[PDB]
Amino acid sequence: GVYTIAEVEAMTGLSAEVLRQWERRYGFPKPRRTPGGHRLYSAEDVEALKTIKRWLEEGATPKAAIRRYLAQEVRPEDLGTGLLEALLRGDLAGAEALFRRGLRFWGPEGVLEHLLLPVLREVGEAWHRGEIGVAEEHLASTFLRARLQELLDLAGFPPGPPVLVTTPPGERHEIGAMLAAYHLRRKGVPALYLGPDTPLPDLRALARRLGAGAVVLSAVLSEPLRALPDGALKDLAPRVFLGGQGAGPEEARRLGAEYMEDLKGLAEALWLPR
């Protein structure tokens, strides 16, 4: 069930003014609205506000108290599990807080390996078991993809012609592409992550537009590659690389791309001027 703002004020001791200020300033709580525009708070929120009210009475300040409810109590080893639960619940303010706390323990590489990728993989494993719908999966993936972009920037951006990283059309698995994008930046290659499922005409256009010297594709499934016409990856970039479990030398040769098994060889090839 849910409650009106007048009811929450009586149950918590917090004024309506303060409740609205917190929502505007710290993103919590985040009630839905009636047709009239009136706020409706969940029971979980009310119990959360009672907790926060108690901490304030014990000497805490509003922002820190709210931060403590969203993230700050969770121990480092459980940041991964904590972030996953927040995303499937639709709590993005909580998820952002957990992500921030993660950056307090780890550098960019650490957050990638211990938060983002394990959670994104857990989201997928959950969907495959049918425990979540597509809307939940989309909401979580979009969150994690945006954070990944932020991690890439934290790793620094090398000069030189950019390298576009994505997945073949129809390929929704992007953890390999994400991993490649970061590895390239760490190894000094100006990689730009585009996200998955980039149509070939749009990709060819963007490469010409940005003056990219290379394009990297990650294939987990072998089927989206079999669907592509012969030499469909020929005229995308000066050099076009293909990798992942769903790719091999033969299929790469018939698509007009160069096969790479590991990321180490990929970076070493991108260092070349050709």
Q: Which residues are annotated as a binding site for cob(II)alamin?
A: 113, 121, 124-125, 128, 137, 141, 170-175, 218, 222, 244-245
Residue 245 binding target from ligand B12, Cl ion, none, CB below 5 to 8 Å by type: ligand B12
User: Strand 214-218 relative to strand 163-166: parallel, antiparallel, unpaired?
Assistant: parallel
Burial of 198 (0-12, 13-18, 19+ CB in 10 A): buried
DSSP conformational letter for 216: E
Question: Which is nearer to ligand B12, 125 or 150 (by Cβ)?
Answer: 125
Question: Which is nearer to ligand B12, 14 or 119 (by Cβ)?
Answer: 119
| Cβ neighbours of residue 248 closer than 8 Å, sequence gap 6 or more | 259
Residue 39 binding target from Cl ion, ligand B12, none, CB below 5 to 8 Å by type: Cl ion
Would you count residue 183 as binding Cl ion (CB under 5 A)? no
3-state SS class at 241: strand
Q: Which residues bind ligand B12 (CB under 6 A)?
A: 120-121, 124-125, 127-128, 137, 141, 172-176, 179-180, 216, 218, 220-221, 241, 243-245, 260, 262-263, 266
Q: What angle do CA 193, 196, 262 make, to 5 degrees?
A: 70
User: The tokens 């931060």 sit on which residue?
Assistant: 67
Kindly state the tokens that stand for 109.
């590489």
Residue 221 binding target from ligand B12, Cl ion, none, CB below 5 to 8 Å by type: ligand B12
Contact flags string 37-76 toward Cl ion, x per CB under 5 A: -xx-------------------------------------
Ranked by CB distance to Cl ion, the top (closest) residue is: 39
Residue 209 burial (CB count, 10 A): 8
Cβ of residue 17: shortest distance to Cl ion, in angstroms? 11
Compute the Cα dihedral for 238, 244, 246, 251 and give only its sign.
Answer: positive
Residue 38 binding target from Cl ion, ligand B12, none, CB below 5 to 8 Å by type: Cl ion
**8 Å CB contact between 202 and 227:** no
Cβ of residue 226: shortest distance to ligand B12, in angstroms? 11
3-state SS class at 90: coil
Q: Name the site residues for Cl ion (rule: CB under 5 A).
A: 5, 38-39
